[PDB]
Amino acid sequence: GSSGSSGGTVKVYLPNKQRTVVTVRDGMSVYDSLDKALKVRGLNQDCCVVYRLIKGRKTVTAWDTAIAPLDGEELIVEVLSGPSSG
């Protein structure tokens, strides 16, 4: 959404129709990053997924992955759920 803000942070969209701004570090991973983002609610990196904003497409992300290559972007943290098949 309209947000004319440019600095050293990132917006994290939680599944709790909520969002949290985190600091962009060049070392930590997405897990250690979204870690709190989850704990804050009590979520876990087991039944949760993070989507990246690419050309307006939720591109799943890895936990082991780094958060360095995430300068100026937004991730969507959701809970793994849905009818796989059937």
Q: Domain range holding 39?
A: 9-79
Whose tokens are 């307006």? That residue is 56
- CATH number assigned to the domain comprising residue 60: 3.10.20.90
**How many distinct structural domains can be found in the chain?**
1
Question: Would you state the torsion angle of the CA atoms of residues 12, 72, 2, 36, taken in this order, to the nearest 10 degrees?
Answer: 10
**Is 47 domain-assigned?**
yes
How far apart (Å, rounded) are the C-alpha atoms in residues 22 and 14?
12
Q: How was this structure determined?
A: NMR
Whose tokens are 């969209």? That residue is 13
How far apart (Å, rounded) are the C-alpha atoms in residues 11 and 85?
32
Whether the CB-CB separation of 79 and 48 falls below 8 Å is answered with: yes
The 3-class secondary structure across the chain, one letter per residue, is: CCCCCCCCEEEEECCCCCEEEEECCCCCECHHHHHHHHHCCCCCCCCEEEEEECCCCEEECCCCCECCCCCCCEEEEEECCCCCCC
**Is 1 domain-assigned?**
no
**Is 67 domain-assigned?**
yes
